[PDB]
Motif scaffolding. Structure first.
Motif, PDB file in Angstrom:
ATOM      1  N   UNK A  40       0.810  -1.219   0.000  1.00 37.43           N
ATOM      2  CA  UNK A  40       0.000   0.000   0.000  1.00 37.43           C
ATOM      3  C   UNK A  40       0.844   1.270   0.000  1.00 37.43           C
ATOM      4  N   UNK A  93      -2.188   6.846  -4.159  1.00 38.93           N
ATOM      5  CA  UNK A  93      -3.622   6.681  -3.906  1.00 38.93           C
ATOM      6  C   UNK A  93      -4.455   6.709  -5.186  1.00 38.93           C
ATOM      7  N   UNK A  94      -5.213   5.640  -5.420  1.00 37.70           N
ATOM      8  CA  UNK A  94      -6.096   5.542  -6.583  1.00 37.70           C
ATOM      9  C   UNK A  94      -7.428   4.922  -6.165  1.00 37.70           C
ATOM     10  N   UNK A 108      -7.433  -2.347  -8.475  1.00 37.17           N
ATOM     11  CA  UNK A 108      -6.272  -2.716  -9.270  1.00 37.17           C
ATOM     12  C   UNK A 108      -5.973  -4.206  -9.139  1.00 37.17           C
TER      13      UNK A 108
END
Ligand SMILES: CCCCCCCCCCCCO[C@@H]1O[C@H](CO)[C@@H](O[C@H]2O[C@H](CO)[C@@H](O)[C@H](O)[C@H]2O)[C@H](O)[C@H]1O
Ligand SMILES: CCCCCCCCCCCCO[C@@H]1O[C@H](CO)[C@@H](O[C@H]2O[C@H](CO)[C@@H](O)[C@H](O)[C@H]2O)[C@H](O)[C@H]1O
Lengths: 79, 79
Positions: B3, B8-9, B13
């Motif tokens: 992480x 940050x998305x 994914x």
């Protein structure tokens, strides 16, 4: 993991409510065991059998309370 | 650790999928023990035989299910 993505903000968010709740339900489920293990251990049948009674009502109370929460939660943050 | 590396998305994914799988399989492997240890403890010939079948099928189900996932996973994220 959810926290990093989440920007720091001073007011209460929907994500905070649903986290604190699930944190509580799991914590109470563990605490329930502590109460059950205690009264059972004292070895007298009035109390011996009561332990099971605690277990029986837990199998109903927790799923209902959690189901009540979800209805309250999603109907509040459904807008 | 993964992480931290990752920026940050908001959308899911490929790295998130493969983490959730390994996290689940290990949790369930521990969960299998919890189910086995419960029915085992009451020690009557019935529950015993059941526990052994549970132990027997776990040595086959888990490796197969994990093998099925990898085929599904890598054929999905192979392009
Ligand atoms: O449960 C899920 O909750 C989300 C809440 O965003 C819903 O999402 C829907 O409701 C919210 C209102 O809160 C709208 O802002 C959003 O445009 C809409 O897609 C999903 O339809 C539903 O599947
Ligand atoms: O040997 C090869 O070396 C390269 C680079 O290391 C990697 O090759 C990689 O390329 C493709 C991209 O098309 C990836 O989908 C896949 O993760 C892998 O096959 C693998 O390690 C191995 O296929």
């Amino acid at each position: 993991g959810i926290n990093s993505q989440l920007p720091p903000v001073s007011y209460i968010k929907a994500i905070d409510v649903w986290i604190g709740a699930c944190m509580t339900f799991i914590f109470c489920a563990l605490l329930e065991f502590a109460l059950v293990n205690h009264i059972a251990n004292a070895g007298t049948t009035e109390w011996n059998d009561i332990s099971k009674r605690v277990d029986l009502i837990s199998r109903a109370l927790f799923p209902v309370l959690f189901f009540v929460f979800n209805i309250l939660y999603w109907s509040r943050f459904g807008h």
